[PDB]
Write a protein that binds this ligand. Structure first.
Ligand SMILES: Nc1ncnc2c1ncn2[C@@H]1O[C@H](COP(=O)(O)OP(=O)(O)OP(=O)(O)O)[C@@H](O)[C@H]1O
Ligand SMILES: Nc1ncnc2c1ncn2[C@@H]1O[C@H](COP(=O)(O)OP(=O)(O)OP(=O)(O)O)[C@@H](O)[C@H]1O
Ligand SMILES: Nc1ncnc2c1ncn2[C@@H]1O[C@H](COP(=O)(O)OP(=O)(O)OP(=O)(O)O)[C@@H](O)[C@H]1O
Ligand SMILES: Nc1ncnc2c1ncn2[C@@H]1O[C@H](COP(=O)(O)OP(=O)(O)OP(=O)(O)O)[C@@H](O)[C@H]1O
Lengths: 328, 50, 328, 328, 328
């Protein structure tokens, strides 16, 4: 009995034997973007090191083939001025590819092959530099830094609203930065079965949020309560108190999707509630108060609730007894 | 693995209604920088019991 | 009695005692993007200064450990050519990291440790340069410059349309640049209460705009009027004239969300109307006229309205008297 | 009698007396992005010229204040090596800010103020370079190059479908590159009037496309036909043949919004049809044929139609005569 | 009889005689982005080569017009120091435009025209560099690397659910990286005909997915089953077993659209099923199992199904016999 999604958005499911291989040479960029910072740093640094050393070996080898390390006779001019050790060729490669070019060690017309090497190293340097910079960009424009500030109470409560027994939960945003088109997809998951008999382990039913329009967008500035009204079409219409417990196959997946204000990109936070975390018969205490010329969202006691009794039977038996009391 | 993380009353036990030194550092606890801030509004606005 | 959102989109709510801390080392980028220009400028400049000075101290210290400042004997060759003062090492660090490299002061093979320092400073320079450039990019691609041009009249009017009493307001876009998928979410907010008794301070009900399709997208070229038809399902169906006033707990939050034409990113403008700004019984005068071979949106007198009487009772009592007059 | 939107997406409406001013210092970037290429080019070039010349004057002035142009006595060392003309200081500024740094003219420790100037010019150079590069990026990632390939026949036809009289038009995409979430918002516009009497010049009614789901998304690969079924709720339900003509106040605004495949950004194409372009009683001839092992979209004769008669009365009178013939 | 879309998302339709031409000078960027890597590489490399050689010819010509190749008299100073061969001018151009600037060959005040050439080459170098880097960025941020991991079983099955005969298919995502706002647009396509008689070759009907809300978004973590309930409004309500076959004009286009998690951009995968691939009377075997403290999605046997009988008649005749058996 695992959690489908962790209380912090971790999709707690392993793949175990994908058939095929990955992307030929594009998975490099995607797998590069989302990755721990020091590892990415190290990869780029070591790319620069290998690019420098490779052409360093190249220049050194060229100077040595030109017969330029031994003679120093004064007459024959080098392919590249004043290099006498592999250290020299390495300094030269760094000067070239980093576009520093001090000048004490400089390419000469005496070796057109050396000119080819220069062109090659410049092209490679620009290509690798642009790749590194595009990667560093799309990494520094990363999302899900905000997706951690989007908080959700550890518990969800049900209560009576409009004479109806509706499942609720409070949502929370901690950043003053605003999410755009914030959309809710509450989704109950269990191992359910069709009448014909087929059962699927993680079945998924999009349970609709009760919105005056009916849509799924919200406008979260002050951390509010998301809630579903349990209708005879809702799968939770057979739910009862004391049926919920950490050993009851039951879970409602909560999805929050919107656009970051500063970065036009989209992020998603996930939270889940299995049966026990769904507290029966409570109400989230209002954590907002009219401050002195302001609205005071007391973020303390954020998910703190209050217990309230209720008819301790299914919304099914709710409508049963209600019809029996109304047709009387 | 264990942060032994926290149970800070300075913010928590305060709950948002407090007037004293603890959240302030020892330095201000000697030099009343927080009290400087507190007086800062007393010029722009007459103080009240609320 | 504060305004939930200012007449200019300011979410006038403070947080006051978030529990946890921020993002470990990613909040740096987000908090960096949206920030006043001179402060960001200064931060980057001072990053470059500290990066230059640190390696300046490094090079100077290396020259001094090599015993290269005192002798000038002519025989022993320096780690780096021709540096005699910390000023020299600082100029050298600037030449290196900015990739200038004049040449009068140049790295030599005599100190492999100096070669290590060179590699280190080049790597750090490229990393810091890419970070600064990614930040400058995602800052210069900033939104909400357009979100200020999206204007909204200081007042909203109600009138009779289709024999029905519908709340209205005019929207305005001042830029010729177009917003894509411009979507409206009018949302009334007050301290309302369920029948069971729970009250929430800033309750939020998405009041649906009257759209021929029913959706919430618009196509704003000429500044038009957004309006809600007040039905028995609308919370405003108990509203009456003279109930609106600046001391009546009431406010309707207006959200505009779309994609900037030039920058594919999304922006959001906010405006709000509390009870008094909701002028009762008026109509926004048509500010458009068929120009000479053109459509003349007289942006002057933009929100200027005209007063019109109306049955001065609730849409509830409207339907009451209407049913009494139709079933007669 | 102007066209609201040109047959090529031009919003043919002038603003004429916006009240306020523009964006303080952010409108620069937005107004910079969407702008004719040579003008933007020239602006950046001239920015580089002014940045070079300003510091050129700076360096020249410093050399002249140091008393470094006249003496050439050999003893006193310059602030910067070997500059003798303003041309020299200008070459030096270019070498510095472009990060070339040949070396023949080089900063010296003899003037710390010159070191300050160097730091200043490097910082300014990096800032201006990043700004220019961010602008060039968001300009080269520009949209609406695709929005021109999204073609629309010059005419729209009505016909009978499902025994119903539905307004139609063919859509066209010419690029093999795919649009994502391609969404249609047909929108009829005219100077219409409420029963209470208020008239608005460019009134706008979102006329819903007939989609099996009901939504507004399409999947355009082969250029297909968009169509609206004219129901008693459609404003076009009072339309009749011979009522359409280029002097009949009538126009239906067609909006296409989706995401470019290569660039995740969104684009919008617009086309409009006033009364005459709405051909009465025709059908777009199928321009697709099953090619040899392929689907042959004959893009030729793209908007070519075929005439078909029809009951030449309003959909109102259509349902009138239909009810009279069915209740017979 | 071709497939509309290949089993791997290829839109198997040719255009054949687009009327007009392309985009004046913007199609360059779009056509540049999506393009095979080596070709793009080569284009950029050769752009750098031509930019270098052009100014190389320029500098060489200037030195030759200055009468600077022949004399070497010692008195007259060159436009640019120490160039004697076109090879020299080419090395110089590379040093300039790549911002290396060794120093052995350096611009001098003796030729203001040479200063103009320097300014020109620097401006051109920066412009071309920014263009290349923007292109390399928007190419390295490319999508549809993920769109290949979004897998779909080679077959679709129908079965009985809720006493109803609903068309199904399993969806699959292989990356742990998450898709946001994953939306399904199943769309049946055939050569169908209105009652009035018009037939269109590739007609397209958006067949709605059965979702508890009714919308088209999903939350795909474990590869699940997408399904349509065949109602009297569904075009498939006249479908029968044994009517499906690879020579039956029939195909259901499946569209998956969402936002990549790391890159806020949107991607789309396509898959299609013609009549035979639609296996009649089966059920996809549940490939998920509760692992040891985990959910085990056995990605092996991914699309493996199991055969189940069913009433072998149309959903039409299903409701016929069902009404006959219920009204009995
Ligand atoms: N005042 C607060 N500010 C910010 N985040 C909070 C706050 N209270 C709780 N959270 C976060 O919300 C998540 C679940 O909230 P929960 O309802 O469990 O709060 P809690 O642990 O009960 O604390 P409290 O009793 O103060 O609400 C936790 O992971 C926690 O980090
Ligand atoms: N002609 C206009 N062009 C652009 N913006 C305007 C114009 N008129 C008003 N606005 C903006 O709309 C906002 C609210 O409009 P409001 O209806 O108050 O206009 P107003 O102050 O009554 O001026 P007017 O009487 O000209 O409409 C104001 O903040 C103002 O900046
Ligand atoms: N085969 C085609 N390929 C691409 N674009 C086309 C084609 N035919 C027309 N267009 C474009 O569609 C727009 C309106 O099409 P329209 O129905 O007028 O075509 P047309 O001028 O009648 O030509 P034809 O008679 O070939 O359809 C025009 O601006 C035209 O550029
Ligand atoms: N275990 C798997 N992991 C990843 N991809 C798979 C797997 N099985 C099939 N696919 C992919 O799904 C596509 C269609 O799936 P299909 O139902 O044909 O699987 P299959 O070939 O029958 O293999 P199997 O019998 O294992 O399902 C194929 O192109 C294949 O690459």
């Amino acid at each position: 009995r695992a959690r489908f999604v962790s209380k912090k958005g971790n999709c707690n499911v392993a793949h175990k034997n994908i058939r095929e291989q990955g992307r030929f040479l594009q998975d490099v960029f995607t797998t590069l973007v989302d990755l721990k910072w020091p590892h990415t740093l190290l990869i780029f640094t070591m790319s620069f090191l290998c690019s420098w050393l490779l052409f360093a070996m190249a220049w050194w080898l060229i100077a040595f083939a030109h017969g330029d390390l031994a003679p120093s006779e004064g007459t024959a001019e080098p392919c590249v001025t004043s290099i006498h050790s592999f250290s020299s060729a390495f300094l030269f490669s760094i000067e070239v590819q980093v576009t520093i070019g001090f000048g004490g060690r400089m390419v000469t017309e005496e070796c057109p092959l050396a000119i080819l090497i220069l062109i090659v190293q410049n092209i490679v340097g620009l290509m690798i530099n642009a790749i590194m910079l595009g990667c560093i960009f799309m990494k520094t424009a990363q999302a899900h830094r905000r997706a951690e500030t989007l908080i959700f109470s550890k518990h969800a409560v049900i209560a009576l609203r409009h004479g109806r027994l509706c499942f609720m939960l409070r949502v929370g945003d901690l950043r003053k930065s605003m999410i755009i088109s914030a959309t809710i997809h509450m989704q109950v998951v269990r191992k359910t079965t069709s009448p014909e008999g087929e059962v699927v382990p993680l079945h998924q039913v999009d349970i609709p949020m009760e919105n005056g329009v009916g849509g799924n967008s919200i406008f979260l500035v002050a951390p509010l309560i998301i809630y579903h009204v349990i209708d005879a079409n809702s799968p939770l219409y057979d739910l009862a108190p004391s049926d919920l417990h950490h050993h009851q196959d039951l879970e409602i997946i909560v999805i929050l999707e919107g656009v970051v204000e500063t970065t036009g990109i989209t992020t998603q936070a996930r939270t889940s509630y299995l049966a026990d975390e769904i507290l029966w018969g409570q109400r989230f205490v209002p954590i907002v108060a009219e401050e002195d010329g302001r609205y005071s969202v007391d973020y303390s006691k954020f998910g703190n609730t209050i217990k309230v009794p209720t008819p301790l039977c299914t919304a099914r038996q709710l409508d049963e007894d209600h019809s029996l009391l109304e047709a009387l | 693995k264990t942060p032994r993380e926290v149970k800070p009353p300075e913010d928590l036990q305060d709950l948002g209604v407090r007037f004293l030194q603890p959240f302030v550092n020892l330095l201000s606890k000697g030099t009343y920088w927080w009290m400087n801030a507190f007086i800062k509004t007393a010029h722009k606005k007459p103080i009240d019991l609320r």
